[PDB]
Amino acid sequence: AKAKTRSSRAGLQFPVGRVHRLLRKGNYAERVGAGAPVYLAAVLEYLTAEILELAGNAARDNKKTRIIPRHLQLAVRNDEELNKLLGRVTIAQGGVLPNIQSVLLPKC
Amino acid sequence: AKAKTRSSRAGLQFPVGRVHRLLRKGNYAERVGAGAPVYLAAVLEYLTAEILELAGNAARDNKKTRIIPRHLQLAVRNDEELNKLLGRVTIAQGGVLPNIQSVLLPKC
Amino acid sequence: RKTRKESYAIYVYKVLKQVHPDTGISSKAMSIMNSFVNDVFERIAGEASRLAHYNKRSTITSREIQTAVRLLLPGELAKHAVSEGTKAVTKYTSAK
Amino acid sequence: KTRKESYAIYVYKVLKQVHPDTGISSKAMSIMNSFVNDVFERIAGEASRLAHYNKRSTITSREIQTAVRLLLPGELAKHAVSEGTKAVTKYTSAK
Amino acid sequence: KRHRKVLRDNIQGITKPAIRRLARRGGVKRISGLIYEETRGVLKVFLENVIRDAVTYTEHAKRKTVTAMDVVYALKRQGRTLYGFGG
Amino acid sequence: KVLRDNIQGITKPAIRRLARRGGVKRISGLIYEETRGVLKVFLENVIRDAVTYTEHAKRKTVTAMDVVYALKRQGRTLYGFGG
Amino acid sequence: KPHRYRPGTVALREIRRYQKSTELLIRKLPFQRLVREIAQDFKTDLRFQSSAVMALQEASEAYLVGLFEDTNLCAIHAKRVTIMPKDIQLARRIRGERA
Amino acid sequence: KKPHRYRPGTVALREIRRYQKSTELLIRKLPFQRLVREIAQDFKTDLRFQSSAVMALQEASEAYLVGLFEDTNLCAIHAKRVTIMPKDIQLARRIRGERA
DNA sequence: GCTGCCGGCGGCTGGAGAATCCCGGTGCCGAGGCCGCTCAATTGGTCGTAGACAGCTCTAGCACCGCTTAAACGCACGTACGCGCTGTCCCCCGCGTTTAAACCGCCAAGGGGATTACTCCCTAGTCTCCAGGCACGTCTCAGATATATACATCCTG
DNA sequence: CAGGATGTATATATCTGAGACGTGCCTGGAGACTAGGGAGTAATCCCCTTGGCGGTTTAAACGCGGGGGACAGCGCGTACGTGCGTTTTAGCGGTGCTAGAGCTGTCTACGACCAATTGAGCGGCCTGGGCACCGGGATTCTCCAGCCGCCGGCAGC
């Protein structure tokens, strides 16, 4: 007995079993290997941790405690590498990045 | 008993068997129906016939007997609807439609 | 003299002779036709399978193909294709 | 009834592992759920096509690796592979 | 009097100050007077394109209600995917 | 005169002919470097994916199917070389 | 006598004000009426969920803002300060939407 | 007599007429192949290139540049000029969505 | 007034350099007959998705009105628009000539592709029990409001 | 070219209370424990097609030099889009109200799967000859620069 979760052995916080079930029932391939769910879970964890840490820093800069879509937008749009990945997507209640053309500004 | 092709019974010039086998081995779904291959073959036959006729008209226009990629490009780009269907496809040895801006022309 | 391949050459040529009984086709144009047929087939099949899974079903039927056609071909092609497909499938089921 | 799956708990844990003193709103969590759901398919479809491309039949870490290399732009992918390898090199050592 | 209350000329409901606010958010300084119809036209055609797919999704689903899932679904189809509505 | 970087191999008359096919009438004196830069960038953005595809299959040659597949990934399909 | 600001001063203030807020800019009821008017031609006697309504509103909002950005760029290119429909149909055709 | 020299802006239209019916490539094959081989060195060393892939890449890059130049000409004509400048190229790549 | 007088004005003439047509010889390569093999058509039984009916019931469109806030109308006016003159110098466009790509042929060999024996990894099957979704249940500290001061304009002298 | 007055922004005080964060329950699906047999894995060999070489030659690139007209700058008329006051009109809301359409559960039956035989559709490999290629030469086809008759100002009276 003494069952152990695969995530605990892999040292991850994501449902390896859930990802493995999704791979089987997604009709992606006839047969599925073993390390693929672990790799995919690790990649997802890395991306989500990076995004969430950036959003948290952005929210802290605004002197707020919680996270709102405005902070998510302000964190995503300020990273060009992340901008390339999320170029063709839009988030609800995000607003726009404040920018003003220099010509329209007064003379001095 | 004597055998006969499915296309003969459906009055088609496209292979039902090959398309059905592709539907099986293409991973697309677990099970496939019966009318789906016939329907898809009919649609493919329609599209091919329309393209071939449109290319043949242009081929006969320039006093030729065999079709050339240039004729295919000319037929595709001269029909706006088919152009929308194939909006981002680039055809090898197709050149470009003849067009000149009005301003660049002389005064008279 | 081995590893035989597959293509759509014969059917395309057969359709050509039923439209312009005096016209031929070069090799590059025929390959272009083959590629276009493959691309359209892959697009329609992918859309139909996506829709079949979207409603959590498990089988692909004529209805899925019809909706996929309606979702891709703009306007005139859509109705002409659905009409010809319907008449063809009725012809098939009527004559077993 | 009719339980619906979600990624709320694990996203909350990951948030706690970097910021132990910051909360999250309601929509700000569904946004991250949708992002994860999008990326999952965006990687799995590419991996599936890549496996079919070579007439193979099973999905292994190698095709997922190539998918990560293609999708994630540059330096980010440069990191990801390492952790990915990390994430498996322990698991094979102790199953 | 149960249903089919067909209305007309509701495109004019997009008032001028709304367009002024949208443009100010965009970041322009001066606004002409001839754009008030071009914007109303492009918005209208965009709505037609979205609603066609939105409706045909339900038609395939053989239902009589249009949910949010279908709207997001058709927005993703034309490469305009949107986060924040349970994708 | 043999030391010539391959990027310089794109001669100015070639750029002029490309522009004429485009449909332009007059050309200034600075397009010839912007075009060279754009060409190089677009070349790398496809050769990277193609070469990666070569690496995955353990081969050592960049076959036609590989290059057309990588172009299809970028959103520019190609007809003629198979598919 | 009474204080009048130099022309174009209030425009700059609205620019830096609205660029910060995040709420919607179009009233919900006229938008719903327009959506209901349009939906009839495709299949009559339908039924709408709200979440779809504000989803459509957000999508149209984003599209209009994106279009106005390129319109401003085309206008400022031509050594002008206002915006004209010609910039709009230039931007819509360079993108390839109307090509 | 004086030698016959054409008025400015006519031979250019003649080449415009001539090239828009042609289908052949307009870039020398060997320099392009050398450029491709040189630029592929960084990713991996000692690679082999099949013949068809080089011409495929060539005509793809020809079509891309042709489209970019057409869009640039349209943008330049929009600005009540007849000449094209690098800023038009930059603005076109801004709007189409490639540089940023 | 009216004589030249002068420069343009468009209208026409004809030379000039380019693009087009056809004829006549020559190939290279789509189009068709041939052989066979390998997969598609014929039979045959099953058992489990999918169609029906038969229910329950959450919720979306109607209505009703009180408030009120932003939408519609007009109104001085200055500023950014559009046109017109203009001074070049920088691209267009032939010419000599200098050069590298294109053709053509002969080689070597490393890597791509077909064949084969096999092994051990993931699927097929059961039993089991604990992580996660549902229903609450709150008190939070998250916001929401109201208040009070510095600030950057546009005028003045 | 330096101050004053201003309507804006900024900060800071109270509420204040819908809903992030636990807190339990229970369930169904994820982990523990059994072969097997077929999918990939080395190992082999056998072509082949690609990198490489070395003469011509000949059409394309290159640097020069001459020239004219598109372009950025400057200036002026002007008219219409902006800041502001005065209605008023439809949005927001808050309250019920109702049946319609959406959700789930049972039962049955039929059609897609899979396995075993048998024959013909098509993929390969020559093979003859026919439509596109190429050349020169006559045939038109626009492009241009100057000549000429006319015309409307321009010095005088």
Residue numbers in the entry:
A (entry chain K), B (entry chain R): 12 to 119
C (entry chain S): 27 to 122
D (entry chain M): 28 to 122
E (entry chain Q): 16 to 102
F (entry chain J): 20 to 102
G (entry chain O): 37 to 135
H (entry chain I): 36 to 135
What does the paper say about this structure?
Polycomb repressive complex 2 (PRC2) trimethylates histone H3 on K27 (H3K27me3) leading to gene silencing that is essential for embryonic development and maintenance of cell identity. The interaction of PRC2 with substrate nucleosomes involves mainly two structural elements within the catalytic subunit EZH2, the bridge helix and the CXC domain. A central mechanism of PRC2 activation is the recognition of PRC2-trimethylated lysine peptides by its EED subunit, resulting in conformational changes within PRC2 that lead to the allosteric activation of the complex. We discovered that H3K4me3-containing and H3K36me3-containing nucleosomes inhibit PRC2 using two distinct mechanisms because of the differences in their positions along the histone H3 tail.
Previous biochemical data showed that PRC2 can be activated on H3K4me3-modified nucleosome substrates in the presence of high local concentrations of allosteric activator (either excess H3K27me3 peptide or PRC2 complexes copurified with methylated JARID2). We, therefore, determined the structure of PRC2AJ1–450, thus including JARID2K116me3, bound to an H3K4me3-modified nucleosome at 3.5-Å resolution. In this structure, we observed an activated state of PRC2, with density consistent with JARID2K116me3 occupying the EED regulatory site, bent SBD and folded SRM. Importantly, we could not locate the histone H3K4me3 modification elsewhere in this reconstruction, supporting that JARID2K116me3 and H3K4me3 compete for the same binding site. Although the activated state was prevalent in our data, careful sorting for occupancy of the SRM led us to identify a second, rarer state (resolution limited to 8 Å) in which the SRM is unfolded and the SBD is extended, although the EED regulatory site remains occupied. The existence of both allosterically activated and inactivated PRC2 states in the cryo-EM data agrees with previous biochemical observations concerning activity under conditions including allosteric activators and suggests that JARID2 and H3K4me3 are mutually exclusive binders of the EED regulatory site. At actively transcribed promoters, where chromatin is highly decorated with H3K4me3 and low in H3K27me3, the high local concentration of this mark may outcompete activators for the EED regulatory site, thus acting as an allosteric antagonist.
